[PDB]
């Protein structure tokens, strides 16, 4: 399968810093038919970022509404995104589950709205420290994946992201070997629910802490197809993370 | 005080519809030094909308983050808005309180962030049908206003909006006089918490159903300083609503 490297800039950026960062990103010569590279800027930065990045880079937004057009102050619908040709959306990032009480049902309905409007979706899930220490990793992941997995109508257009919440801000670290085993089981869930060929087609990204040093050890695992990168994607050195997928 | 007419487009619009609507808006010759007119497009429409609207029209976004810059996927910080010269924010709209569990505590934190970053804030509140039928109108609004009102230093830069939830989708209609009675009570609350000069300074907008037929009767009321308009602001006849404040 085609490797997939994505930059989640989160709530960061200025007009000036994006101008500088996109310029350095543009200096990297890669073939977009050999790997997908997606940048997810803040909503109000999307136009600025899209124009500054060369066409080899894909772009998207960090969240999409579960509702359609109408009386939903502050929301961005999938149909609005389609009209702007916004190619990708992130759904279910743990930060939205944590601070904004986004549920599994919210994730299901957001994916449905996105696919209905021909958007490509990056869907995130993962277990907490308490859940892992109670030996509930498989139980939690299965429930989270089964919340939306049956809706996938194209296995190039939906991309999965494992987020090891147990290793984020806890002092614990997730090893590539531990990541590989989870990814293996995620692909198994997709097999049992969607089919074998579909499971082998779908990309599953690692969504924990990724940097220039650990990136290659992660992507070289058989069932890890790329990353959704946080802090490291705000730096010029992000090009070296992309190089691990080249 | 300076009147204030605002367009809340909510989750509506295409690139083509905005181009057509902004053109009609631009035909209205008004003096921005004597009247405030603000349009609130969808975040991903902001740049498009700002570039098409003549500068006599102020612009803003429909929501702002309670957090600053950092790891908050999907959010737009008050710092990012300032960098883009986004002038206004809407805070505490009933649709965000209803659908996205936004609390009085969220409203306070959003206002603090907005003021710290020198943004101007349109802050909404109001009681439900049940609360009004139990004669709790003043009790509800007093709590809602006191959640944030002590943060206001510049009383030209914070704008209040009364939303009569009891007359929104309930089958009930708020008369202009019934709105006025609440507006006057709100101003008394500001007077007794912030001061007399400050209460006289602050603008209080009506945020219920506003259209071309009722706008004149509303603005005529002594304590109604303008409107935050929903559905009617998506129409070219919105110019007639602005004209009632001229």
Curated annotation (Swiss-Prot), chains A, B:
EC code(s) of this entry: 5.3.1.1
Record GO cellular component, one term: cytosol
Family, per entry: Belongs to the triosephosphate isomerase family.
Assembly and binders: Homodimer.
Keywords, comma-separated and alphabetical: Gluconeogenesis, Glycolysis, Isomerase
Effect of substituting residue 94 to H: 6.7-fold decrease in substrate affinity
Pfam families: TIM
EC supergroup of this enzyme: isomerase
One MF annotation (Gene Ontology) recorded for this entry: triose-phosphate isomerase activity
Function: Catalyzes the interconversion of glyceraldehyde 3-phosphate and dihydroxyacetone phosphate in the glycolytic and gluconeogenic pathways.
Species annotation: Plasmodium falciparum
Protein name: Triosephosphate isomerase
Domain of life, per lineage: Eukaryota
The keyword Transferase is assigned to this record: no
The UniProt record lists the keyword Cell inner membrane: no
């Amino acid at each position: 399968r085609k490797y997939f490297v994505a930059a989640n800039w989160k709530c960061n950026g200025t007009l000036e810093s994006i101008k500088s960062l996109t310029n350095s990103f543009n200096n990297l010569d890669f073939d977009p038919s050999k790997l997908d590279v997606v940048v997810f800027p803040v909503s109000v930065h999307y136009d600025h970022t899209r124009k500054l990045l060369q066409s080899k880079f894909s772009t998207g937004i960090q969240n999409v509404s579960k509702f359609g057009n109408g009386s939903y102050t502050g929301e961005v619908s999938a149909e609005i995104a389609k009209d702007l040709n916004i190619e990708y959306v992130i759904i279910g990032h743990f930060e939205r589950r944590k601070y904004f009480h986004e549920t599994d049902e919210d994730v299901r309905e957001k994916l449905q709205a996105s696919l209905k409007n021909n958007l490509k979706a990056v869907v995130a899930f993962g277990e907490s420290l308490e859940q892992r220490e109670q030996n509930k990793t498989i139980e939690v992941i299965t429930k989270q994946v089964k919340a939306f997995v049956d809706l996938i109508d194209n296995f190039d257009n939906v991309i999965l992201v494992y987020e090891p919440l147990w290793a984020i801000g806890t002092g614990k670290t997730a090893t590539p070997e531990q990541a590989q085993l989870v990814h293996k089981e995620i692909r198994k869930i997709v097999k049992d629910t969607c089919g074998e060929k579909q499971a082998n087609q779908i990309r599953i990204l690692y969504g924990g802490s990724v940097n220039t040093e650990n990136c290659s050890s992660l992507i070289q695992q058989e069932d890890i197809d790329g990353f959704l990168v946080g802090n490291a994607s705000l730096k010029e050195s992000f090009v070296d993370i992309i190089k691990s997928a080249m």
